[PDB]
Amino acid sequence: SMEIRVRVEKDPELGFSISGGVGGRGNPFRPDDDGIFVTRVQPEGPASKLLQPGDKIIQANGYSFINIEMGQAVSLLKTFQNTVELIIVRE
């Protein structure tokens, strides 16, 4: 795996969906991982060609997503304006 930095600019949203979280309902890639996983990406949205299903988000605008709950991850990402700098784990 690898740590990739991507910048997704809200227009007006980031354009992707996430699954997982600590105590959450899991993810379709690695069930033994309570991390946050990109699950669906809008074909021509702000995250298109930048994020892919399976991406594990471990940092968003300097905020670590390790041991984060889903409700908190969604809350944080909706709070950010403009661009969100992500650090993702990609195969």
Add this chain to the structure above:
Amino acid sequence: FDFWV
């Protein structure tokens, strides 16, 4: 069960 951001 995914959430759109």
